[model samples]
Each structure stands twice: as C-alpha cells, then as structure tokens.
Target: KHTLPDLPFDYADLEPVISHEIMQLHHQKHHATYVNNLNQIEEKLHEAVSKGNLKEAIALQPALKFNGGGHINHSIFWTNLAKDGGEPSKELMDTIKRDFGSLDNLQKRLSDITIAVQGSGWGWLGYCKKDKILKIATCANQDPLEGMVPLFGIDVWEHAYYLQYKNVRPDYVHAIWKIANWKNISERFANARQ
Candidate 1:
C-alpha cells in the first residue's frame, strides 16, 4: 500500500505565503485522500489484472491516473516550497538563461501560464531529456507531467490558494515565487541532466 510522505517542515513553516490552515488541510486532508484512493484502486487494479479482467482493468485507468497523479504531483510540490527563496545555482541559472532568456523572464512566463490555467491545474518547469531544454507546461485536473521530466511545479488548484488569496490566483502565483525552493529545484535539474 502506498503511504503519504511526511512533510519536511512544520505545517506553519510556509507562512505569509501559504497559511497554516491551508497547509494543514491541503496535506493532511487532500493529499491523504489521494493516497488512500490510490492504494484502494491499485488493489482493485491488481485483482483485475490477475483475474484477466481486461474490461475492469481498462475502466480503472481514470481513477489510477487521477489518484496516482495526485500522489506524484503533491510529492514534488512539497519539496518545491521553502521558507527562504534560495537563488538558483550557477549551472541551473545558465540553463534557465539559455532556455528562457533570463531568470526574470522565466518567472514571468511561468507565472503568466500558471495564472491563466482557467481552472484547477498545475504549472511546471520541466526538462526535456531528448531536446535537453527546459520548458513550462500546465496540466489540468491532476494530470501529471508527461513527455518531460518535471523539475518543480506549483499547484494551481483552487484548494491550493483560495483560502488565502481568495480567487486572486495571480497573487498566489506571484507570492509562490517568493518561497520557491530553488536549491531543491537546482538539484533536480542537475540530477535530470545526468
């Protein structure tokens, strides 16, 4: 059975940007539901596969995708946040500059895409291994990043910021940059390049 991972910091640690209430409910409640649902569906999926029930297995795809994507997305999202907005490493900065022209430009572009998500979704900075390029992508409704390696991402689901920002998703997206864990993100970039 899959289990929810413990958060690296206290629930209140991301304060001023993400409030304690949001973190508490988002992690303890929302993510917990994903973990539970994933585990249950996987168990059924296993039974379906073992019994040669192709139809049943096929029908489970959406549930698997939604819950599994939730699990995967939230796992990365937790590490993507930090109290201090650490500057990107030189190597990472160079790549960001090459791909997006400048660090500020990258932020602007990502924020713009993220703010315009239309509804529940995510904003991702992903690395395409084949092209060796960084790109921004968005996925709606628990859709995980596909085709590229997700370096880091921001959750744009209403549950992510509605409590604090109150429908002003742009404000939440902008504030999220202030707490971005560039150190973690840089490490992910280095690892993906390897």
Candidate 2:
C-alpha cells in the first residue's frame, strides 16, 4: 500500500507564498485522501487482474490514474519548494540558458503556460533524457509528466492557492517563483543527465 510521504519542511515554512493553513489542508486532507484512495484502488486492481476480470480492471484505470498521479505529483511537488530560493547550479543554469535563452525567459514562459491552464492542472519543467533537452509542459488534473523526468512543477489547482491568492492565479503562479528550490531541481537535472 502507498503511504503519504512526510514533508521535508514544516507546514509554516513556505509562508508568505503558501500559507500555513493551505499547507495544512493540502497535506493533511487533500494529499492524504489521494494516498488512501490509491491504496484502495491498488488492492482492487490486483484482485481484478488475478481473477481475469479484464472489464473490472479496465474500469479501474481512471481511479488509478487520478489517485496514483496525485501521489506521484504531490511527492515531487513537495521537494520542488523551499522557504529560501536556492540558486541553480552552474551546469543547470547553463542548460536552462541554452534551452530557454535565459532564466527569466524560462520563468515567463512557465508562468504564462501555468496560469493559462483552463482549470486545475500543473505547470512542469521536465527533462527529456532521450532528446537531451529541457521542456515546459502542463498536465490537467493529476496527470504526471510522461516520456520525461519531472524536474520541477507548480500546481495550479485552486486548493493549492485559493485561500491566499484567491481568483488571481497569475499572482500565485508568479509568487511561487520566489520559493522555488533550485537546489533540489539541480539535483534532479543532474540525475536526468545520467
């Protein structure tokens, strides 16, 4: 059974950008439900497959995708932030410059794409190992990045910032830049290169 991962930092640590109330609810309520649902679906899925119940198994795909992706996405999301913004490593900065022309350009592009999401979704900075390039992508709902390694992501789900930023999703998107953990992202980028 999958379980909720412990947060690396305190609920209040991300304050001024993300509120303590938001983090408390997001982690304790929202993410906890996803973890529980995924475990339930996993058990049912195993039974369906074991009994040769293809129909049942097929019916379980959406739940599996939603909950499993929720778990996957949130796990990465936690590591993608920190109270203090950590600068990217030289190598990572070089790659970002090469791919997006400059760090500012990348932030602008990502924020635009992230805010433009029609509804709840995520804006991602992912690494395509096969192509040896960096890409900005968006996924609706809980869909995790596919065909690439997710380096950093900003969740645009209302629950993520509604209490703080309210209707101004653009404000929330831009504010997240202040707390992005480039150290964690740099490590992921290094791993992706290998």
Q: Candidate 1 at 94: error in angstroms?
A: 0.2
* Model 2 clashing-pair count: 0
The lDDT per prediction is: 0.94, 0.95
Q: What is the TM-score of each candidate against the true structure?
A: 0.98, 0.98
Candidate with top lDDT is 2
lDDT of 2 at 107: 98
Report the number of clashing residue pairs per model: 0, 0
- In candidate 1, what residue range of length 10 has the lowest lDDT sum? 80-89
Model 1 CA deviation exceeding 4 Å by range? none
Q: Write one digit per residue (lDDT tens) for candidate 2, span 2-51.
A: 89999889999998999999999999999999999999999999999999
Q: In model 2, what lDDT does residue 184 have?
A: 97
Error of 2 at 40 (Å): 0.2
lDDT of candidate 1 over 28-146, digit per residue (tens): 99999999999999999999999999999999999999999999999999999999759898999999999999989999999999999988899999999999999999999899999
